[PDB]
Amino acid sequence: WRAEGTSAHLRDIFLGRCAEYRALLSPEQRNKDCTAIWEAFKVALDKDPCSVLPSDYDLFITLSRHSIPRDKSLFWENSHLLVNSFADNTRRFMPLSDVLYGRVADFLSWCRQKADSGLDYQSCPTSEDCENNPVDSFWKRASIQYSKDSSGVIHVMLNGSEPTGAYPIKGFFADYEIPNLQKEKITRIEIWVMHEIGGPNVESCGEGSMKVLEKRLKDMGFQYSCINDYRPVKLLQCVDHSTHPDCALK
Amino acid sequence: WRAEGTSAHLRDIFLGRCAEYRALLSPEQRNKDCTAIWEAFKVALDKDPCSVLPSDYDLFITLSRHSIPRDKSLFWENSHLLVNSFADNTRRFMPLSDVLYGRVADFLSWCRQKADSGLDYQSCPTSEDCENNPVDSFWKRASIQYSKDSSGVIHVMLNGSEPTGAYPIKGFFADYEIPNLQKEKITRIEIWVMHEIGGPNVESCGEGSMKVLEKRLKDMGFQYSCINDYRPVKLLQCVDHSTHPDCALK
Ligand SMILES: O=P([O-])(OC[C@H]1O[C@@H](O)[C@H](O)[C@@H]1O)OP(=O)([O-])OC[C@H]1O[C@@H](n2cnc3c2nc[n+]2cc[nH]c32)[C@H](O)[C@@H]1O
Numbered sequence: 001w002r003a004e005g006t007s008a009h010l011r012d013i014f015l016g017r018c019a020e021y022r023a024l025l026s027p028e029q030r031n032k033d034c035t036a037i038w039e040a041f042k043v044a045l046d047k048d049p050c051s052v053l054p055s056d057y058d059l060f061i062t063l064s065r066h067s068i069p070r071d072k073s074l075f076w077e078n079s080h081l082l083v084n085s086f087a088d089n090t091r092r093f094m095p096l097s098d099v100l101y102g103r104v105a106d107f108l109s110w111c112r113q114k115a116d117s118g119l120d121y122q123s124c125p126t127s128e129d130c131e132n133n134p135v136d137s138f139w140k141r142a143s144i145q146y147s148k149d150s151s152g153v154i155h156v157m158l159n160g161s162e163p164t165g166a167y168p169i170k171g172f173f174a175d176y177e178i179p180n181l182q183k184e185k186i187t188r189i190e191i192w193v194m195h196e197i198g199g200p201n202v203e204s205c206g207e208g209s210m211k212v213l214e215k216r217l218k219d220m221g222f223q224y225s226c227i228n229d230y231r232p233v234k235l236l237q238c239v240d241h242s243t244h245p246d247c248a249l250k
Numbered sequence: 251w252r253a254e255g256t257s258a259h260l261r262d263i264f265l266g267r268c269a270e271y272r273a274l275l276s277p278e279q280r281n282k283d284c285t286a287i288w289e290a291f292k293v294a295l296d297k298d299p300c301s302v303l304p305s306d307y308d309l310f311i312t313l314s315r316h317s318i319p320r321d322k323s324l325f326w327e328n329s330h331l332l333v334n335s336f337a338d339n340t341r342r343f344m345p346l347s348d349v350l351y352g353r354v355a356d357f358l359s360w361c362r363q364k365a366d367s368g369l370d371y372q373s374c375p376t377s378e379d380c381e382n383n384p385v386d387s388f389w390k391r392a393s394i395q396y397s398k399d400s401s402g403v404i405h406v407m408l409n410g411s412e413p414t415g416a417y418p419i420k421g422f423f424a425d426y427e428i429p430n431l432q433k434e435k436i437t438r439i440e441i442w443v444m445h446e447i448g449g450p451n452v453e454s455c456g457e458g459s460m461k462v463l464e465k466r467l468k469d470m471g472f473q474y475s476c477i478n479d480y481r482p483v484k485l486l487q488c489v490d491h492s493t494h495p496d497c498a499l500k
């Protein structure tokens with residue numbers, strides 16, 4: 001297996017994060033059973049590391065699902081840490097990592113041993129090793145639910161400094177999120193193409209892969225808009241480059 | 251009493267946070283027993299809610315204590331959320347909330363019932379109800395250790411928009427941290443007096459209580475400097491006021 005092995009203390013972390021998140025839920029939906037959610041989740045840990053399907057996580061989603069505020073969804077590519085920091089634990093936005101079922105798995109890895117009941121802490125399969133591995137099937141199931149339950153203005157943070165372009169035509173956003181958005185429930189889709197401070201401008205709005213994305217969204221009937229280096233996010237990036245000209249204040 | 255009851259799922263939250271923090275420790279000190287740490291913490295918990303002393307947490311500290319990188323300490327008053335965000339989970343600085351023994355308690359509340367052995371989830375005592383309460387004694391013990399183990403350049407974030415002054419002569423910083431700093435291993439102390447965007451300029455460096463702080467630190471023999479609205483932090487505040495003139499980029 002060419003992927004990271006199971007995360008140490010997976011259970012304590014999972015339950016801990018689930019417990020903390022409940023407070024972020026409104027009383028009406030605050031009644032969640034972290035123990036039951038964990039039990040449903042670990043069903044993938046009793047199966048062959050290459051035989052886990054997205055649907056195996058149906059119960060897990062059923063027990064952890066909650067509503068996502070209108071206009072607060074944030075999709076992304078190649079911008080993991082910036083998305084989490086900008087979202088600020090649901091205070092500004094609610095990316096999947098800030099939704100209960102995504103929150104319990106952010107940064108984690110897991111899989112059972114090939115021929116043993118115990119968890120494999122050495123390594124886990126990648127899509128390359130085999131398509132139906134625990135982690136990929138989880139994020140497929142999770143991104144599908146996240147997308148279906150989003151409404152209002154859809155925000156997407158892309159990395160304009162990524163060498164392969166801002167929009168990967170193959171991946172979760174393209175293959176599992178875009179196809180599951182509820183057109184009738186969506187106002188418009190707004191893209192933020194972020195560039196590293198001084199970093200390279202590989203692609204900006206309307207260039208390369210961005211043209212492909214723009215065309216697909218528009219062909220699907222979505223109202224579209226793209227912003228290069230959306231200011232609120234640029235300011236966050238600048239916190240670590242305060243003396244850089246791109247970050248100088250008037 | 252007058253304070254909020256003990257946090258729900260305290261144990262799961264405690265253990266999860268402990269488990270996640272371990273990854274943030276140097277391999278040389280990553281050897282931490284979260285369950286044992288919890289038990290040591292419980293020693294102080296399972297007592298009369300008005301009979302807990304800082305020393306009751308000695309075992310808890312001993313089992314969770316680890317080193318703090320030189321020049322990475324960040325003390326503060328009246329800016330809890332700004333400090334946590336700026337520190338960015340030990341990435342920029344290591345405030346007490348980003349040190350193992352502080353991390354497991356950040357935002358939490360706890361106390362055992364006055365007459366029953368179970369935890370009191372209804373309410374907990376304040377300094378007013380009684381001085382020796384679980385939470386206050388905890389932070390006293392923790393702030394002492396955090397101060398004793400800090401070295402190099404000392405950073406302090408104060409709120410210059412606080413009505414009553416930037417430096418509270420009665421607070422944990424003044425009463426439990428300043429007196430425990432080890433001058434021998436400290437190079438200098440640097441203050442950042444932050445003002446709310448457009449917010450009020452109650453006090454800036456060299457004014458009111460700030461004069462009190464400067465004189466006390468200099469009387470103790472420390473090298474001192476103060477900065478109004480330290481840029482990196484101002485940029486972070488600006489993320490939420492991108493259009494405000496104080497935040498306009500060059
Ligand atoms: O590997 P990275 O350089 O990031 C940093 C990562 O380096 C890894 O060693 C370490 O685990 C860390 O998370 O780039 P990455 O984009 O591959 O980001 C993949 C990460 O983002 C998390 N994640 C949060 N939201 C989602 C998601 N995963 C899938 N989906 C599909 C729809 N939504 C999501 C997921 O838990 C995964 O870890």
Ligand SMILES: O=P([O-])(OC[C@H]1O[C@@H](O)[C@H](O)[C@@H]1O)OP(=O)([O-])OC[C@H]1O[C@@H](n2cnc3c2nc[n+]2cc[nH]c32)[C@H](O)[C@@H]1O
Nearest residue numbers: 327328329330346347352355356357358359389390393422
């Ligand atoms: O009450 P707040 O509006 O905060 C917001 C929170 O007050 C909590 O009751 C409620 O749950 C609320 O979410 O403002 P606050 O400044 O009083 O900050 C007090 C908070 O800072 C945490 N904390 C992190 N570091 C320390 C510390 N507490 C003491 N010390 C002494 C030296 N170092 C520290 C501590 O855990 C406490 O929650």
Ligand SMILES: *[C@@H]1O[C@H](CO)[C@@H](O[C@@H]2O[C@H](CO)[C@@H](O)[C@H](O)[C@H]2NC(C)=O)[C@H](O)[C@H]1NC(C)=O
Nearest residue numbers: 078079080081082159160161162163196199200
């Ligand atoms: C946006 O993409 C760039 C380019 O892929 C990322 O920067 C690279 O990050 C890797 C790993 O941290 C480094 O090894 C490279 O040297 C970086 N390249 C450059 C040109 O800086 C950047 O981290 C991405 N931004 C976000 C928020 O994820």
Ligand SMILES: *[C@@H]1O[C@H](CO)[C@@H](O[C@@H]2O[C@H](CO)[C@@H](O)[C@H](O)[C@H]2NC(C)=O)[C@H](O)[C@H]1NC(C)=O
Nearest residue numbers: 328329330331332409410411412413446449450
């Ligand atoms: C710095 O101090 C100011 C003033 O005490 C804080 O602002 C107040 O915050 C409370 C609680 O959020 C509000 O109800 C008041 O309306 C605010 N007043 C003003 C004048 O802003 C501010 O939050 C503090 N800064 C930080 C980072 O904690």
Ligand SMILES: NC(=O)c1cccnc1
Nearest residue numbers: 075076077078171172173
């Ligand atoms: N934000 C995403 O769509 C995503 C997909 C795959 C891995 N990490 C993040």
Ligand SMILES: NC(=O)c1cccnc1
Nearest residue numbers: 325326327328421422423
């Ligand atoms: N950082 C501190 O000194 C402090 C003091 C009292 C309450 N919260 C934080």
